[PDB]
Amino acid sequence: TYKITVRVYQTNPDAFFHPVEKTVWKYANGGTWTITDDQHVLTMGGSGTSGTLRFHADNGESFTATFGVHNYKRWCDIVTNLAADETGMVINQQYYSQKNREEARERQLSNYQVKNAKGRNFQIVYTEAEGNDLHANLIIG
């Protein structure tokens, strides 16, 4: 089993994001998104799968944060500027079919940040980046 426990930090009162979708990819016997003490917990059956959280703000901004384990190490990626047909389940699957997404996954990043077209920054940092009980902060700018 691998577990990724995500704490969401919102740093910027000019918006408020909330989770609108939580998906689990089918490899490695799948897994679950649960909630413990306000943290999003992705539990997976082994290495090689992942799960996507999609967040939406009132003003129409949105992003996906995806977390998983590739070759026994954590990975993460953020996709923003989402098209109206890019739901979380679309994004999640693309990590196993679309080359640019596959490559992002295979980099096994413990830390990644990117901005949307409005200039808002989004960041994932694993504070526990080793072993089977992984912990990450999702930091919204």
Add this chain to the structure above:
Amino acid sequence: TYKITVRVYQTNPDAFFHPVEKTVWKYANGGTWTITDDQHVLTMGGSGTSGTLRFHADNGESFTATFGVHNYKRWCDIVTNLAADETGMVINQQYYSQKNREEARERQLSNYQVKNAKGRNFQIVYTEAEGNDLHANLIIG
């Protein structure tokens, strides 16, 4: 916009189900799964999409409950006895690719029930079953 507000009723203390995944299909400008007063709310950009909730009990049982709108009329379906590679996002997409699932959607049911292999009943009943503001009970036996 179409909205489907879902109330979950668990009636049998021999199990406890909890939501482990919530997906939104890409058609009709997608949508969101939000929470209001312990109710799961699927808000969709128009007719022709859906979203899936997957529930797991710690005794191993699981199922998906899918809710959507097809040619302006609500639909629903439940899939039980899930394989370990049948996550909610796999199931949700099957309503637009796998014949038996497409047919279930096309039925435009205001209510649907099915039992799993252990004999547990699962039912969806739309108590507000017309118009753009739809309300459904998900009743676990």
